[PDB]
Amino acid sequence: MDALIMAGGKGTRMGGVEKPLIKLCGRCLIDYVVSPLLKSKVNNIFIATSPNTPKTKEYINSAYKDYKNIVVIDTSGKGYIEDLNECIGYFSEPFLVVSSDLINLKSKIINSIVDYFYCIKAKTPDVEALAVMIPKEKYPNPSIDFNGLVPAGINVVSPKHGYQKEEIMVIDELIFNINTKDDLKLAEMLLKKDGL
């Protein structure tokens, strides 16, 4: 599969313009996101950026100037579904969808999502997309309230023009997103734990 990392002022947090360039202990948010994906089952990483946000884009461009499997694309990323729609209309094969504000080792997640999705198609060919999400209530970082649902990591879509059947999977793995100072502290504590 191919992977899409859409960093263009969008992520799974609040809305408006999320900052994927928030760096923590050495790497920027997106860099932490992309690193596992690059080494994971997925071959090429297509990073979706927008003209409304090339700072993230100029960073990415600069960070991965030696890009072997890193591909930077320009699209509607200002709008989450707008981007997805553009991307689904340009890819010839299924690709992974990610949020740039998710910090956690995705290596097992990537493999699990792809496998589970393929398993679903195997039994039910009609399924073209996969979504993994977790209840907001157990989610470690509620922006406003625990009402609602949030993606647990990565998403799978087929490359078509329009919306498609998407399956739902619930996991018990938590992600740490960075929006504010407390979040950095929260995330740095786990890194600190790994440092010990």
Curated annotation (Swiss-Prot):
It catalyses: adenosylcob(III)inamide phosphate + GTP + H(+) = adenosylcob(III)inamide-GDP + diphosphate. Pfam families: NTP_transf_3 (PF12804). Gene3D superfamilies: Spore Coat Polysaccharide Biosynthesis Protein SpsA, Chain A (3.90.550.10). GO terms for molecular function: cobinamide phosphate guanylyltransferase activity; GTP binding; nucleotidyltransferase activity. Keywords: Cobalamin biosynthesis, GTP-binding, Nucleotide-binding, Nucleotidyltransferase, Transferase. It is an enzyme of class 2 (transferase). The keyword Nucleotide-binding applies. SUPFAM superfamilies: Nucleotide-diphospho-sugar transferases (SSF53448). GO terms for biological process: cobalamin biosynthetic process. Pathway: Cofactor biosynthesis; adenosylcobalamin biosynthesis. Its EC number is 2.7.7.62. The keyword Secreted does not apply. Homodimer. Guanylyltransferase that catalyzes the synthesis of adenosylcobinamide-GDP (AdoCbi-GDP) from adenosylcobinamide-phosphate (AdoCbi-P) and GTP. Is involved in adenosylcobalamin biosynthesis. Binds one GTP per dimer. Cannot use other NTPs or GDP. Does not display AdoCbi kinase activity. Is also able to catalyze the condensation of 2-phospho-L-lactate (LP) with GTP in vitro to form PPi and (2S)-lactyl-2-diphospho-5'-guanosine (LPPG), but is much less efficient than CofC, the presumed enzyme catalyzing this reaction in vivo. Binds GTP first, before binding AdoCbi-P. This is Adenosylcobinamide-phosphate guanylyltransferase. It comes from Methanocaldococcus jannaschii (strain ATCC 43067 / DSM 2661 / JAL-1 / JCM 10045 / NBRC 100440). The gene is cobY.
